[PDB]
Write a protein that binds this DNA or RNA. Structure first.
Ligand SMILES: [Mg+2]
Ligand SMILES: [Mg+2]
Ligand SMILES: [Mg+2]
Ligand SMILES: [Mg+2]
Ligand SMILES: [Mg+2]
Ligand SMILES: [Mg+2]
Ligand SMILES: [Mg+2]
Ligand SMILES: [Mg+2]
Ligand SMILES: [Mg+2]
Ligand SMILES: [Mg+2]
Ligand SMILES: [Mg+2]
Ligand SMILES: [Mg+2]
Ligand SMILES: [Mg+2]
Ligand SMILES: [Mg+2]
Ligand SMILES: [Mg+2]
Ligand SMILES: [Mg+2]
Ligand SMILES: [Mg+2]
Ligand SMILES: [Mg+2]
Ligand SMILES: [Mg+2]
Ligand SMILES: [Mg+2]
Ligand SMILES: [Mg+2]
Ligand SMILES: [Mg+2]
Ligand SMILES: [Mg+2]
Ligand SMILES: [Mg+2]
Ligand SMILES: [Mg+2]
Ligand SMILES: [Mg+2]
Lengths: 185, 65, 56, 144, 134
RNA sequence: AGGAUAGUGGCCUACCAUGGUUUCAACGGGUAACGGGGAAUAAGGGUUCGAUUCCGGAGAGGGAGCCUGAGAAACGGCUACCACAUCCAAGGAAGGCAGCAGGCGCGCAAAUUACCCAAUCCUAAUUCAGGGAGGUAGUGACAAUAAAUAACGAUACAGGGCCCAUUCGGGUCUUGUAAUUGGAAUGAGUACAAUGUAAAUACCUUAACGAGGAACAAUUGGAGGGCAAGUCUGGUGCCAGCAGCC
């Protein structure tokens, strides 16, 4: 038989189920970033934990351990490449500090609202979803996307669809058809 | 004959592919399940094989109740 | 003895009451918008402490 | 000195004494002796079909008073005869004689839920259909 | 043909198969993907070997429209194509005609029936003729 | 010492000797035991598993035997016994799915009697032929990834920042409640075509059709404690039932 596909779980569920402290702190993050599930939160805190997992494990190695420097750069190279690590904080173990919020900020869904463009984070999500708004030649509709900050000024409404010229939209299209039917002929 | 249908049939039926085709007439026949007897298994462990069997026998014939 | 006799007793006795047609509750992201709003800004149900059910 | 040896060469006595003393652990002992095979009305499986021999009523333990409404089942794989609680209001009326039922355990690893003496199983399906789905008039017992 | 702009990346000459191989990369805004017989001549003129001798396949159109990506070949001649080319795609191009056959299961049955005859099989064709029914 | 083997060897035979293993656990019993790479849970240490994508090994109903051949103690080879079992004109003949589908049985427990060598590779006298290996599709809430079920105005209201203030507020930012209405966005479907593929199917591209809420309508568990969330109303009255535990 041919080889197995590998697959992995992206998320991890909390241990105490009914601590209101976590229940409320979660819901604040939902309305703020326009999320639906706690899975959306859990995925990110699991990512963040899968990341401190590597981070504390490198500070235990003494400075100038070729592995420490090599993946220490590799990490932060990937973390201000997205804007979830600020440019100054490129220093080594500022990483251990991040909360989840820095990721939800760098989500595609949030930028489309924090770049004007949406008027509400809930409006942002459905704008992404419905084949509007794109980066270059590429049309993107995954609210959790991690804009790379090489792109937060390279994203306008897509070349297709209204809000972007280049064709008129389809609800006004039927609405304006009978604009020339109850007008006599 | 059709295979793989039996498990959905008690004794008879109509097969259609219309959304609203009706059933089919009920085959008025002449004899009737009138002479009865009583059964149970010689060995008690066998009752499950008997209750299953009685459903299986009732498919065998068009008349046995 | 002491038969079943009365199995469905209360369920068979509890008078039927009907559900009512309601405003449909939104599903998905839009619902946690409601929990956000209905718990953080224009929640027209608070009562001094933070309480989630009135016996008016 | 704390009861056990410490020497770098006392691995044998250390390992062999855990082996000895693991036996006072019920969960270990039930596994190694395989009493879910030798004992245990189900084969050590989670469920079991069965032919309902008769309805049956059991008075609860005190302080409570009520009739709990069990059935008596002969397990198809086993012959073994057991009793099983039938959940929820009424709902005994869904059980006829000698229609197959699927029984589950009682969420208690043997033992028994509070009221009911000597009952370690619950009906889950009867005549092939889910019990709850009959309680809620959402599914029908199969046609005669 | 809305600004069809039929690009062609990663090319190299292959005498061992008597053809030149390359990937195609077509843009087509407002133009919802572009056909193959269509694509075959829009470059059959580019290196104008015969139109009946240029071959292309692959072609997953990209997301949000406006692109597609294939893989193509140009043969030195038509006859060097038919010969070296996959027999199955010569017929979409049209230069070959499909071969009707018998169903794979049905020809397998005949194989196993002929395992039961040893000779020509026309020896027993006559022994049955005489008898039955005497 | 010979015999035998492809060849070492108590592998076997003749002769001789009395040796060989064991509490540092032999021998025996059990395994719901094929080993391993590995899987689950993991502060660290550990605990539990591994029939199952690779590797090694064993088997082809149970045993033995054997022909062929470089290679088999072969099972889609033969011979015999044992168990099961088919056909028949009763003289006789033939059998091996732990291969692919499919069925019985068994059970809590597991899919199509479908298409094809196009890819992956394999074989042969062989570029060509064969390949239920393998690939495709069917079935599939085993597990895993992403993530629609609405967005946004206005009407009125409860109001909530507010520049003037002898001012009921003379401007207001904001927030939502009530069928109060409004035009925008859209894929789920469906569907030109192309694309896809060996030929199709779905996907991706996309012509036309596809949203007002009575629909394009999300469920599953629960609201005494553990434990997030009612001292609401009606019903029943140690009955029915709930209740992991209290
Ligand atoms: Mg579009
Ligand atoms: Mg002990
Ligand atoms: Mg013991
Ligand atoms: Mg003791
Ligand atoms: Mg059942
Ligand atoms: Mg020798
Ligand atoms: Mg075994
Ligand atoms: Mg093992
Ligand atoms: Mg396990
Ligand atoms: Mg294994
Ligand atoms: Mg096994
Ligand atoms: Mg398999
Ligand atoms: Mg193997
Ligand atoms: Mg073998
Ligand atoms: Mg067998
Ligand atoms: Mg053999
Ligand atoms: Mg073989
Ligand atoms: Mg075979
Ligand atoms: Mg299953
Ligand atoms: Mg089955
Ligand atoms: Mg092939
Ligand atoms: Mg071939
Ligand atoms: Mg498949
Ligand atoms: Mg799933
Ligand atoms: Mg309840
Ligand atoms: Mg509470």
């Amino acid at each position: 038989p041919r080889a197995p596909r590998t697959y992995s779980k992206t998320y991890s569920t909390p241990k105490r189920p009914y601590e209101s402290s976590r229940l409320d702190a979660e819901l604040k993050l939902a309305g703020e970033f326009g999320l639906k599930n706690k899975k959306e939160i859990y995925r990110i805190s699991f990512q963040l934990s899968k990341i401190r997992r590597a981070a504390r494990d490198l500070l235990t190695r003494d400075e100038k351990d070729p592995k420490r420097l090599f993946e220490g750069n590799a990490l932060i190279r990937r973390l201000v490449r997205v804007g979830v690590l600020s440019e100054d904080k490129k220093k080594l173990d500022y990483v251990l500090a991040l909360k989840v919020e820095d990721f939800l900020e760098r989500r595609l869904q949030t930028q489309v609202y924090k770049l004007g463009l949406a008027k509400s984070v809930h409006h942002a999500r459905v704008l992404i979803t419905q084949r509007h708004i794109a980066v270059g030649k590429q049309i993107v509709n995954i609210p959790s996307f991690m804009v790379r900050l090489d792109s937060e000024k390279h994203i306008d409404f897509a070349p297709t669809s209204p809000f972007g010229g280049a064709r008129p939209g389809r609800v006004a299209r039927r609405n304006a058809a009978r604009k020339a039917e109850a007008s006599g002929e | 004959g059709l295979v793989g249908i039996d498990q959905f049939l008690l004794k008879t039926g109509t097969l259609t592919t219309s959304e609203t085709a009706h059933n089919m007439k009920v085959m008025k026949f002449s004899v009737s399940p009138v002479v009865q007897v009583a059964v149970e298994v010689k060995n008690a462990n066998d009752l499950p094989k008997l209750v299953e069997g009685l459903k299986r026998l009732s498919k065998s014939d068009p008349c046995v109740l | 003895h002491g038969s079943l006799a009365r199995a469905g007793k209360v369920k068979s006795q509890t008078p039927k009451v009907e559900k009512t047609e309601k405003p449909k509750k939104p599903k998905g992201r839009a619902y946690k918008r409601l929990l956000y709003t209905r718990r953080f800004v224009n929640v027209t149900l608070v009562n001094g402490k933070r309480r989630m059910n009135p016996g008016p | 000195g704390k009861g056990k040896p410490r020497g770098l060469n006392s691995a044998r006595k250390l390992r062999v004494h855990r082996r000895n003393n693991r036996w006072a652990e019920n969960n270990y002992k039930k596994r190694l002796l395989g009493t879910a095979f030798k004992s245990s009305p189900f084969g050590g499986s989670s469920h079991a079909k069965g032919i309902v021999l008769e309805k049956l009523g059991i008075e609860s333990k005190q302080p409570n008073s009520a009739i709990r409404k069990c059935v008596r089942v002969q397990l198809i794989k086993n012959g073994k005869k057991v009793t099983a609680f039938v959940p929820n209001d009424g709902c005994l009326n869904f059980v006829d004689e000698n229609d197959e039922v699927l029984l589950a355990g009682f969420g208690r690893k043997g033992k028994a839920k509070g009221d009911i003496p000597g009952v370690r199983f619950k009906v889950v399906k009867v005549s092939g259909v889910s019990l709850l789905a009959l309680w809620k008039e959402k599914k029908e017992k199969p046609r005669s | 043909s809305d600004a069809v702009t039929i690009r062609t990346r990663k090319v190299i000459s292959n005498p061992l198969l008597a053809r030149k191989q390359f990937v195609v990369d077509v843009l087509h805004p407002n133009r919802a993907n572009v056909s193959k017989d269509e694509l075959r001549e829009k470059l059959a003129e580019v290196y104008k070997a015969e139109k009946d001798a240029v071959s292309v396949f692959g072609f997953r159109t990209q997301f949000g429209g406006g692109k597609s990506v294939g893989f193509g070949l140009v043969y030195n001649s038509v006859a060097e194509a038919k010969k070296f080319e996959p027999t199955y795609r010569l017929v979409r191009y049209g230069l070959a005609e499909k071969v009707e056959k018998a169903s794979r299961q049905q020809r397998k049955q005949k194989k196993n029936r002929d395992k039961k005859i040893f000779g020509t099989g026309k020896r027993l064709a006559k022994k049955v003729a005489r008898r039955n029914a005497d």
